[PDB]
Design a protein around this ligand. Sequence first.
Ligand code: NI
Ligand code: NI
Ligand code: NI
Ligand code: NI
Ligand code: NI
Ligand code: NI
Lengths: 117, 117, 117, 117, 117, 117
Amino acid sequence: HCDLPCGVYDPAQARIEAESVKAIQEKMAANDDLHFQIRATVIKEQRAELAKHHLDVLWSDYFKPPHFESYPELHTLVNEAVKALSAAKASTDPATGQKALDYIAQIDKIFWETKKA
Amino acid sequence: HCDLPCGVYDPAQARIEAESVKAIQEKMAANDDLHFQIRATVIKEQRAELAKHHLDVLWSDYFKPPHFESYPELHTLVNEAVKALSAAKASTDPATGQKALDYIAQIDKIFWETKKA
Amino acid sequence: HCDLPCGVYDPAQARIEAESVKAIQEKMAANDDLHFQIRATVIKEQRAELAKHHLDVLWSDYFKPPHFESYPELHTLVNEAVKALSAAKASTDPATGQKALDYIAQIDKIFWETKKA
Amino acid sequence: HCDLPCGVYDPAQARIEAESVKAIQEKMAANDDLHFQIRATVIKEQRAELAKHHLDVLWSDYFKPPHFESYPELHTLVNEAVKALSAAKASTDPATGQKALDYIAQIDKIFWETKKA
Amino acid sequence: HCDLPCGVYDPAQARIEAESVKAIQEKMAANDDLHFQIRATVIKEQRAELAKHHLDVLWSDYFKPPHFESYPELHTLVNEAVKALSAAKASTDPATGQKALDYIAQIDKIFWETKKA
Amino acid sequence: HCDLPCGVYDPAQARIEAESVKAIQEKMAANDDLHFQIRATVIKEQRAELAKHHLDVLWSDYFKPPHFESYPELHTLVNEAVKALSAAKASTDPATGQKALDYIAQIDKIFWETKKA
Ligand code: NI
Ligand code: NI
Ligand code: NI
Ligand code: NI
Ligand code: NI
Ligand code: NI
């Protein structure tokens, strides 16, 4: 995932950051304190960005043409996952974080299938 | 391109960085000093990574679902573009840099097209 | 602009970031939702900082002694441009973003003169 | 791990980066090309630095006084783990990479025990 | 502090960053404006994170096993210092900023003792 | 130095990084091992860049029009210091590092004089 390439990839990198995004949204629903809301917003923004980056790397570095052929829906799925993460940055509703996690789980399923080749 | 979103995007951000990648390769062919080769490799890696990032942003943030419909080859185009940049990272041949610049040139055309649409 | 040096420079890097700063300020006037204001402020801070970095690079790396000799106002001009960006960070008024853009345009004009020459 | 805090932690982040480190050391032994050696060295340095950061976060954010009391060796363990990652930066021997992974495995074990608790 | 290693370390790096934290907390009590509060929180978050980073570097790179044996309280001291910085992030009370600073002083004293020795 | 502004500045930040740059150059002269040379180059590059960043901030954020009026040589002195740092990036000669340290000492002197007035 370092583009050497190193041959070491794992959707867990994206998942763990997306889990923080959703966990932050959940905590935002419980505390309306201004300062807390500002910090949560700032940190959620950064974790979502990191999650988007990990997915972009899977898409550009790990998945190859044969993969995009075996799963003709892969491009859309990844593009949807990153767009779902952008929507999560702009929201405090845990449902947006959940949508991103759902898309990531599907990407993760495909990923390990390509690992079984 | 900041994901606010701000409504400001431009393939030029990617081109300028890719231009440094090619310029660096050309300098690499003419100067074989070790320390220069080390510094040049390091910097080319960074500029190419910034180029990939700029393209990833256009793909994930700028291009909307309707855009991919109107240009069903855009997914592959951007994916080849980023991979072309990855190839440039592992090459001192100015042609690799040019290849990446060529893909970016196509993407730039579809971009301005969606802008005027 | 990578300090190799690579020979590739373009004030357009600073301008695009400055354009985002202004565009964000424009939007901040039309939406007073608290979370939107927080995200807008956070993101404007980053785009302004990037614009400052790009100008600093032009000043330290691209412009050389003969240039400062030919344009004795250049040092002040760049310094004012970066200070204008700092003021844009601390403000929601689109005028502050515009002022930074106007200095950048002046810098850009001087830049292309040094290129043609 | 974002310090909000979000409540989401996983030694896996550290492990994935450390695996890249060892994987790169292995590839280096096989390819003696100068440019590949440079890229491998640069990238290994970055992945190791990331691994160190992830471990630093667990030590400073996740682990609390009660944990250090129940595990009097934790401070030294984590410290030795990060120092091992430092040794891995300065080495091409895949063994140095394994030593870091071994330490991370120990931290991981203590981690989940504090989770199940 | 760069981990080459370069043999150049100084708790000053952490102290200056921790100083901005307290200074910002003080300025926050003097201005209730929303945008100012947002910016101050955003910037305080960054400065504290850098201070934590600098202490982590000292803890993992500068201090060697003998130091932790010579000063049995060192591990706990550094850990308390970074946690105090995390507490400053989540607070606008200049006191939290000061507390983190007092810890840094104690660490700075031990640092010099190990130096002169 | 964070641009809030926070009111906390110190040329020492630049100095400490420049000191690592010269130290690294000295080490490079005593060890010709390829991998050490690669790491030393990569690290010296990052430290020199950070030193430049710190000087850029002093120039853009700390020094004001009255200071530039009082010290007509200030613009040139700072620009010389950052160029000296760029030269040290491209060199293994400790003399280039020492030249940057010399300019920083002059800037430091002026800095503290402005603190006395
Ligand atoms: Ni990798
Ligand atoms: Ni944007
Ligand atoms: Ni360049
Ligand atoms: Ni977290
Ligand atoms: Ni160092
Ligand atoms: Ni500051």
